[PDB]
Amino acid sequence: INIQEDKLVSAHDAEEILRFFNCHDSALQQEATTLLTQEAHLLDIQAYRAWLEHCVGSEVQYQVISRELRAASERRYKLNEAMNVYNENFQQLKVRVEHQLDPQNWGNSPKLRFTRFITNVQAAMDVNDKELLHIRSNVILHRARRGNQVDVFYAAREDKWKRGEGGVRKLVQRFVDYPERILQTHNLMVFL
C-alpha cells in the first residue's frame, strides 16, 4: 500500500497488511484458529485461571487503547493521542483475574454470561524472530447479565504469540485500538 495515494491509511495499518500478504501458510492459519477458539472458550466459561495458565505468556503486554478524536488534517497538536483502557503485564492481569474470582465481587452474582465470536483470523511468522507468531483476528463479544443488560463489543486484535512452557504457544502481546470512542456498554470490563 502507498499511503500517499491511499490517503485514509495509517502507516501502522499499512505495515500490518504487508505482514500477511506475503508468505501465506495455510497450516499456520489453522493453528492460529485453534489457538484463538480455545482461548475464547476458556474466557467464555470464565475459566480465568486456566486462561492465564494456558494462554498468557509471562512477558505479556495486554493493551487496549482509546484514541482521542482529532482532525484528519491535524498536524500541530502533539499531545497524548490515546489513553490505555488496558495496559497490563502478567501480574496486573492476575490482579484482574483475582478480582473476578473474589466471592465478594458482588457484580458477579448472579453469574455473568459471555459469548465470543472470533473471525477473520490471519497468521504470519515474524521475519526476524522465527519463534514469534503474528496473529490478527476480530472479535464480537456478547455479555449478558441481570435479566436485561446486554453489552456487545467489537474489535480487531493484533497479537503476538510465542511458544512458552511445555512448547505451548502463548500470548505475549495483544493490541486493540478500540473503535468506539465513547463506550455505550457501561464499562470495558471484558477481556477482548
Binding site: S66, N80, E81, A82, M83, I182, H186, N187, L188
Partner: peptide, 11 residues
C-alpha cells in the same frame, strides 16, 4: 491533567 480522558456512558 493527563489526557485524553476515558469516556463511558453509565445508566
Amino acid at each position: 491533567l493527563v489526557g485524553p480522558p476515558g469516556k463511558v456512558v453509565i445508566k
